[model samples]
Target: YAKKPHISALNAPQLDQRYKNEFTIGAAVEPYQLQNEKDVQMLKRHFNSIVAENVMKPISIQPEEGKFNFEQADRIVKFAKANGMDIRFHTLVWHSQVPQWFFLDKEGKPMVNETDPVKREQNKQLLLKRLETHIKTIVERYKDDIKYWDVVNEVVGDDGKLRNSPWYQIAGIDYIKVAFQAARKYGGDNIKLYMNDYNTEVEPKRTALYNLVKQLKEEGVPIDGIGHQSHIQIGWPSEAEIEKTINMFAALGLDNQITGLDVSMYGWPPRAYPTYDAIPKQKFLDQAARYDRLFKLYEKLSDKISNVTFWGIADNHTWLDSRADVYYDANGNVVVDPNAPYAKVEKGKGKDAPFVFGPDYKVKPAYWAIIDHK
Candidate 1:
């Protein structure tokens, strides 16, 4: 009898080739990525699961007070349902990219930082209640529709301690724990709960996160996985470091993911490559090799990992372009001044001369390296 593809089988071709009758392949996606009906159909055909980006965030879904809008999310969900796609909710709670008014009081000041204890208490109560409501409503809406959720994103710092956000400081450690419980309360036991964060490979951060997750498991915090936000900088962590990081998380005996997988080699003047010409032809080659090595390692440990979600589809859509502000020179020319003094370039004004991604979104050699490895 023929069986359907599972998540793991779809992701690794080697595994899929061996278990052809069994697993599914998938990708995470944003709303804009699907421009029209054709785009939606193509995506559905290519992947087995879909995770919506910005659907459940503070601004996108909850722009105003006490008003939760799910218009865009509904579109995505409806599309997925129509296509028989398994869905993963991108997030429930996060510190960044949230609305300013989320933690604000009637007077328009931040609620948690107020001087009066009574006022602070009121704010905390209101905030927590609001959070609970948001979680209950969203999860309950898609209780049976979506399969997983990133319950609390990037909650643990690389140091393994809970973040010092106002929510954490005032509510103590219960803030995140509450979100998990609230999600479970409404979504039921079917959905998986994840703690997502970046830079999970570095020893200091990984050790801190691993120990905490183990503790949470012991105390019954309901965490089901760790989402390593793998927005990796090429050449920095090295294959050994990445493998070690994956192994450490696996040792926790919990489901883990490479939540955001993208390689950014774009560099600034002094800190990155000194000049546009200094950007060697071999840079992209090296990046390709790095991706190949990482993917190979991932293939080996595919059983331990549940998902590998690239943070964005194209390099232009990557967070790196905005963070690094890569731009061409004044003449609309790619900077090729190999001998240009690095010190002469103003800080934050330095441009990334050459980072390769074809206009068609075809995998450059870097893309080949990753897919070819499988």
Candidate 2:
């Protein structure tokens, strides 16, 4: 009987080589991960592009005004350069995780009196100056190195309204325009600038995001790409919806980049649990199937899409694992309860096995499915 080749058997070839002709294959990495030999080796062997998971975010890069910290981000840039990988700098402006100083007045209190035209205008210019400085400083520093940037991230919420973030409260939706303009001024025409967000495949938010991009383009903004952070789950946002979103943006002549691709199976444990040894077998196969279908769609629309990136390199490196509530034993070791629901899976034990590689850095079926698919 002929059986499908094992995931291990198909691992001889580097993962990115399979998609070289179609588009770039990318992954996100934290600063610490680049320090690990195994992590660096795995990144080099599989991915051709890199995105800083957090270090490149506004809060991390400039926690305090005028005191920029590039140590961690520098390591990532250095690693990408040494390994010949393209770097996608994430996020020039965002609302959350920003320093308290950003929203405070000169007296160190929350900014107020925005209802008055004069006060609002003053606050707006203040905020714009802050945005310009941050964007210019960061973009100019890496203008020649980074291939593209997520100039603004998650600016719209699921409620189909522009998020009332500090940026929005002070400067209104025009903050986005200011951000893209500043990035273009400093980074120049060579660097691709993108606006990224999540849950864009769903309802009114989809149309809202589309309208925002449409307005930006029509206004002659320097927006070159739209990033759909595809933090998806199985059985949600059917394949048709994803393709529709891609096609919608592609028609605008923008570089459509799927910045994140992984199952959002983070909440509760599944009702049934496979044996520890069989864990990768079942999960990896399911992941592979999802990836195969998605890539088949991507292949059909390769002319528009520029890149598709897995959120992280390996299952162990996922952010969901850190956000979920996992129990631990007295010895500080993860306590795995096979019969427990995913929600009750002990801490560290409920790792999101959503990537194309296992914790051991071994290629999973998902990797093969992506590589082998036409």
Candidate 3:
């Protein structure tokens, strides 16, 4: 089928079928969204693998110590199994979205940032114990049903150093090793394990993450892959950089998954534009051009890539929609400062509107770029 001449809701391509020879196509979503029968149909039609947008996190699963909640998680598992799609468990240990108790001292104070030399030993022990329990229980529960797990997510900083997250401050890199071991122990060798992060295409973050993965490999951790979240903007993270990133990790002899894929209408150091219409037609064309370019690279380098998962399915449900960076005036007009550096060139709520489908099921330009580029 030729690319649709107009952006319409009449028909949509099955993305998985179009890219079947390349890599498995996946999307991020929650079980509740399935309540919308339309969304369920959309997910089943286009995606062959799925990851929960939020429900599988430590905070969501075990919000309180020893109290695990799989009510929402089970729904996703049920959906994936029923549709014959694969599941990628989002995360077991991340610095954020973790419950408070995971970082507390024996006395129930904040050990998350304790700097006293005497307490480091105690803190590490307590935190690692909790890590094992959390990973063990969740991994075992869905091990048979899930195909992959992002054992750890976003642990490195932009400076090529471990971000000083509670996980790092407490157990150091030992926490990472332990997390992988726990996942391997409980998840078994059948499910792939990954250390997922964003901005990995940049040098500082990539080099640091590469070094860490190399060390982990030498140390014989159960690490199986690298998850590049790849949350991107319209023309940034140039095609060459992304190509280099995918190849760089492939040398590590580890599988690479583009875990959270999206193209924001805004670039780095985003300027909040007034409503969605403030974005020009040119920008989305730019978005489509880049999507076409990147997917071509993925198709060419498909051997090194395992799965490519969009952060969300369509424009209607993106987390980017929650962003409001522009300052408003007493008149409720967006405060305009076009003269300022990286200034608000115009104002309203800027929507990166970053996805392949429009709100009412209209296939977007980005979709055409993926399946029917230039």
Candidate 4:
């Protein structure tokens, strides 16, 4: 018997797969991933749009003080334009991933430790000026090519309150307002400004986001969109909850994007912190099922939602290693050592299969479920 051809080849069509005119298929491609000709061709074949991330962020452009870099971002934008795909800039302003110099005091020490209001004010001024410069430079540079920009990211917490990040703690609530203003000033009417966050399917975060957008619009700010960073865990925000959240945000009368999506298996041992390997097969299937349901919902509400971007190509590159579980199987359980065991010693015997996609770049059964839904 012969093995089957990979689904990507099987599913590949002469023309791009067509969903309803309302919904467009996209993937979040990084500058680094498109290095290979094969990867670039594969992406051009499969996706109609690309959200260029990190390239436009402060960390990438202004990694150090006053030094601006645009090589990576320019490559992605030019690549997207050459491929005839729409380009969405991932972000213009974010509190995290900030350059070290932005938070440094006049004495070149970290500013958070300083007690003098004058010194603190100087630091604040420096940060604000940097943010403005970063936004203006990036927005103006890519203004003609990109249609949308995440003006800010993850501003609200699970509780629907402004997450008290250092940026907010130091700059106050006005920081968010300022970001939108700056983005608008630089982006002009051509680019759409979005406030992007995660867990929008959860009630607390959803409600908080709705209120924030409403207030921002009422305040005459130029916020034109909302992004639900749907980094959904497996079996989460049940179908009803997901629909409710989408509906609530859609009601806000702003463009919405299902950003940062990567459904994973709820694999974790019944212990302190769960690792990715502990997730079971059933959980992976359930995640696929959830994706199907969510896509179906998108089919219904695609008129309202603008775009959806899967976090990455597959699980191997997932940030899960740092945020979630990293181990695979115990030495005692399997005949062979687990391929990706963090600890050498074995405590239990079980195999871990986190997300459907493996390192080989083949589409797991879940990809079929997604395609079927589409």
Candidate 5:
């Protein structure tokens, strides 16, 4: 079984070698996961690229104003360099996982809710100033190591509009503009700046994202790519849509990357299973077939796409399940937001699962499907 284990044994193939001529296969990882010898061993053997799973986010790096934390993220960069892995910077700007100080007014009130015209303009300027500072700080620190970056994340909502984030409420779209400018200035000409968002294969959402990226390109915003967080389900977002989404953006002459690729075991209005064993065998087959078609498309479009990243290294770090869509409003109250844009668009659910391996750390049918081509 060790020679080429399959079906049950964890016979991990070196994915980097399999797709060396095409795009790089990436594994999203938390920096601390490196301490787990099991994961690092599998990662070194299989993945050619590593993405900062979460540590580099705004809240993690800059929990408070003017102060910065880079220890964990630095650990990830150094590990990647040591292991011969290319780096994909997780993100620079996002509405979630950020400190409240970013939205607070001079009086320590939420400036996003500020109504005074003068104060509102002041708030916009404040956010952009902070945005420039933060992007400059982080990009300058890791620009040489991480050459591909998700410069902005999840800014577009499902309804073909910008989500009402603090950045959006304060500065409209200028924050995104300034973010790219600052990243390019600091990261330099070699790095790729991406506008990353989820559910970019669906209607209204993809078109909206396309319109936004088009304008960004027209204005010469220094953006270099569109990143689709391909968090699709077993049978959703048919191959046609994915291809269209890729070409639609590729027409702009910018690159394409499957930034957060994952195939959910379930679909819209998702529900959880009692256990992994409880998931129907046919469901796994469907998942494998879905991956087959997806990777096939990727191989065909490899010329335009540079990387395809699984959302995690293994099932241990994925979203397994939860009934309520848990989140907090600016006031910090628990809100079960069903109509939230994230709820509408972000299709990756139930974790500890995404990569070519499963919870048991074994090569799965999905893995063979990608390798077998059918």
Candidate 6:
């Protein structure tokens, strides 16, 4: 009984305009995407919110101790402000994508344990100080502009345990609390603080996240939201599971943000084809249907969910395409296995089209399904 959305002459059905009252629609943008006029215009026309895909990560922002580089991230924030888009700072703390110096001593040596308890405690304190400085600096700098901050990302693994990251190894699991506290101290109560991670809909992992959130809340952590990076593929994490995940977090009285949604067909055997023609029409249709079902569910729970953001703007910009290349052998030579199930598809060849826009920015059926879903 849902009415199909009528296409506008512009061919782009601006999602922000359509869903203005329900919830914000957003996309993760990289610096290169903003350089292109067409991509920039497309972003402005559709999404009301923006998250930096990489510029704000620790590796990019603070590659060295006591020195912060904000050039690229600043560009993104300025661009968002100019375009009247709300900014969600991608992350303030994360285990991966960080520099080596973070785990080393003043002399550029790794911090290891000590039989003397005092030395161990001092080492832990040093790491905590570094974390505090990093979080406070970034959050305070962009406090006025950003609406949301991903305080910590991917701190837990699929096995329901805190990731044995350098952060945890040195600062203990309490690093999460430290990051959130620093964000609250500097960013203030105005901005939303979030803990983001992937595979949040699956079992044990889902329960793990719930327990963490529960603990954070009980311990009076200044956390505000939970970001479920719903990077789903076709036929996985059924519609029921999606709804359950949303409601589970919603029941905690916390804002639930579906941070990333995209089809992942990179490793599928059918993606080995060199041309779109080799892929059956039904495959694309199936993807469209999957998108429709997810969006329909999102619509139903708009009152509970804060926002939903696609991982990237177009198919060509997705990480899958960026990593699509032939395998390499130990001897540093290209290894092409004839018997490999999903043979290496040439990079930029029409293999991975998981995004709503094709390479040329033409809206795909997946786009229509999202904008027109009942």
Clashes of each: 8, 7, 5, 4, 9, 0
lDDT of 3 by residue, 1-374 (tens): 12455454336678898888788999999877889877888887888999999999999999999999999999999998999888999999898888998988988889966778789788899899999999999987999999899999998998999988988888899999999999999988899999999999997999999999999999999898999999888777888999898888899998999999988876454555556667666776878887888899899889999899999877767877555366555556654353343422333345657887877677877788887744
lDDT of 2 by residue, 1-374 (tens): 01344444225578778878887889898988887887877788888999988898888988999999999999999998998888899878888667767777665656554466887788888888888899989987999999889999999878988988888888897889999999998888899999899887887888898999999889999899889888876556789999898888888888889898777443344322222343435556666788788888888888888888888987667875554445544665443453432323333434467776767776666667776754
Candidate 6: pairs in clash = none
Q: How does residue 352 of candidate 1 score in lDDT?
A: 35
Q: For candidate 2, report its TM-score.
A: 0.88
Off by over 4 Å in 3: 1-3, 7-10, 113-118, 327-349
Top lDDT prediction, candidate number: 3
- In order, the Cα lDDT scores of the candidates are 0.65, 0.78, 0.84, 0.67, 0.80, 0.79
Which digits, one per residue and each the tens of the lDDT, describe model 4 over residues 217-264?
899888888888776655666767877777776777787787777764
Shift of residue 314 alpha carbon in model 4, Å: 3.7
In model 5, what lDDT does residue 64 have?
98
TM-scores of the candidates are 0.80, 0.88, 0.92, 0.83, 0.89, 0.89
* Cα lDDT over the full model 5: 0.80
Which one is best on TM-score? 3
Residue pairs in collision within model 4: 267-279, 275-325, 276-325, 333-349
User: Against the correct fold, how does model 4 do in TM-score?
Assistant: 0.83
Q: Summing lDDT over every window of 10 consecutive residues in candidate 6, give the lowest-scoring window.
A: 1-10
In model 4, where do residues sit more than 4 Å from their true spots?
1-6, 14-16, 114-122, 267-284, 324-358
True-vs-predicted CA distance for residue 142, candidate 4, Å: 0.7
Candidate 1: residue 2 lDDT (0-100): 10
